[PDB]
């Protein structure tokens, strides 16, 4: 039950999208939630686990590949990882999920 | 009319028997002869100032609307200065006492002052044969909304 | 009997027949003024909850919806408003 609240982030909250933008948004420390697809290369997600651990920020594993994630974020292209800079009326940050 | 670069074709497209003179410069310097079609059909302002020729228009051309006046809807907007209207109507079959939706696609030469688009109810008038199949003229466009002004794509 | 006062049938008839086949399709459901000992705010709850109910002031569960009228929680004090 995750896909319903991503539209809340895509419209209310502020996101950044893709790997390079995410790691920049982790380096700046602003990001608190990163959703990593399952199709993404395990090495790229492995060091995103590391960057997430360095920033002490929530990491969520999407239950599908980048195709599901790209549709879930609402964009007809594909997205490896999506970062949640700030979440509005969405509760994904405050919930354990 | 004035726009669309009417003076661009092979020949000199101006109203016959009009007097032009470069010696005397007058208030408007262009003479255009339009006549009201009559029977209550108003002369459009785009024709008062018109520079279109349309020698077969009732207003600026040399024809005359003498006969029937009909109505219909625009269905054929793929054609310059000529229109075909789908005039739906009914016919009474005697034996069964019931009615039957008929229609004919009559073509009419729109005077370029008027604007037509699909869905706009329009009026036409019989005159001398304009083309072989165009034997009417779009004397008045009674499309205050045309069933489409408030339904088009808006921004 | 073909001679019946459908205009003003007895109170037995209305509660017997279906709502939509009554003379006027009046709702038979209602809203309930309900309180909990752990809150200081009133809460109006529809008869058939249709979804979970929680007091704004204190986080709580009031009546879990079912197909019909919801089974209210154990320590729930209900009244018809």
């Amino acid at each position: 039950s995750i896909n319903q609240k991503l539209a809340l982030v895509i419209k209310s909250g502020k996101y950044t999208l893709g790997y390079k933008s995410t790691v920049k948004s982790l380096r700046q420390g602003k990001s608190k939630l990163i959703i990593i697809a399952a199709n993404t290369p395990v090495l790229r997600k492995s060091e995103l686990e590391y960057y997430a651990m360095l920033s002490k920020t929530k990491v969520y594993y999407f239950q599908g590949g980048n195709n599901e994630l790209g549709t879930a974020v609402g964009k007809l292209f594909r997205v490896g990882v999506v970062s949640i800079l700030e979440a509005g009326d969405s509760d994904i940050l405050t919930t354990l999920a | 009319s004035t726009e669309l670069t009417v003076q661009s074709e092979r020949a000199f497209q101006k109203q016959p028997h009009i007097f032009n003179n470069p010696k005397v410069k007058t208030s408007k310097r262009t003479k255009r002869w339009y006549k009201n079609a009559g029977l209550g059909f108003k002369t459009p302002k785009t024709a008062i100032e018109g520079s279109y020729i349309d020698k077969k228009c009732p207003f600026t051309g040399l024809v005359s609307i003498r006969g029937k006046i009909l109505t219909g809807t625009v269905v054929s907007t793929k054609m310059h200065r000529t229109i075909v209207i789908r005039r739906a109507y009914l016919h009474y079959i005697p034996k069964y006492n019931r009615y039957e939706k008929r229609h004919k696609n009559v073509p009419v030469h729109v005077s370029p002052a008027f604007r037509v688009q699909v869905g706009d109810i329009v009026t036409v008038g019989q005159c001398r044969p304009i083309s072989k199949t165009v034997r009417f003229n779009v004397v008045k466009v009674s499309a205050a909304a045309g069933k489409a002004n408030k339904q088009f794509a808006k921004f | 009997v073909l001679v019946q006062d459908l205009l003003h049938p007895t109170a037995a008839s209305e509660a017997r027949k279906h709502k939509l086949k009554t003379l006027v399709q009046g709702p038979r459901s209602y809203f309930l003024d309900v309180k909990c000992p752990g809150c200081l705010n009133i809460t109006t709850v529809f008869s058939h909850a249709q979804t979970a109910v929680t007091c704004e002031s204190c986080s709580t569960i009031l009546c879990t919806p079912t197909g019909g009228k919801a089974k209210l929680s154990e320590g729930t004090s209900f009244r018809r408003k």
């Binding site: - | 019931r98 | 073909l2 001679v3 019946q4 459908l6 205009l7 003379l23 006027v24 399709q25």
Partner: protein, 129 residues
């Protein structure tokens, strides 16, 4: 669906009248049937009928006094010219002296003898007798 509320009205009355019921109920209670009922009401064919105005077009109840014998609708509503109104009645009326055919008209809704008298025609709504 209910292609004609007038048709289902006159259908319902005949069904209950044949049963002999003293009261019949009609839905969804438009005015054309209400105007139709008035025409019977002035002609004694029908009794006191109570209109119930619920906020969804409501319904009616008609305390028919078991007086008429057959009221029906001509669907669809064929047009008619005054020269041919008598032609229609012969095929629908049990007798000339009694029984009426209802004509909707821009003048109003009336039975044929008055429509003939006031000399205006229209489309046929139904027949009563």
């Amino acid at each position: 669906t209910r292609s004609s509320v007038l048709a289902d009205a006159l259908n319902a009355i005949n069904n209950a009248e044949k049963t002999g019921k003293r009261q019949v109920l009609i839905r969804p209670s438009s005015k054309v049937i209400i105007k139709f009922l008035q025409v019977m009401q002035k002609h004694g064919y029908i009794g006191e009928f109570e209109y119930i105005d619920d906020h969804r077009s409501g319904k009616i109840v008609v305390q028919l006094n078991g007086r008429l014998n057959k009221c029906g609708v001509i669907s669809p509503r064929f047009n008619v010219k005054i020269g041919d109104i008598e032609k229609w009645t012969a095929n629908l009326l049990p007798a000339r002296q009694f029984g009426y055919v209802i004509l909707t008209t821009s003048a109003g809704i009336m039975d044929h003898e008055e429509a003939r008298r006031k000399h205006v025609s229209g489309k046929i709504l139904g027949f009563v007798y």
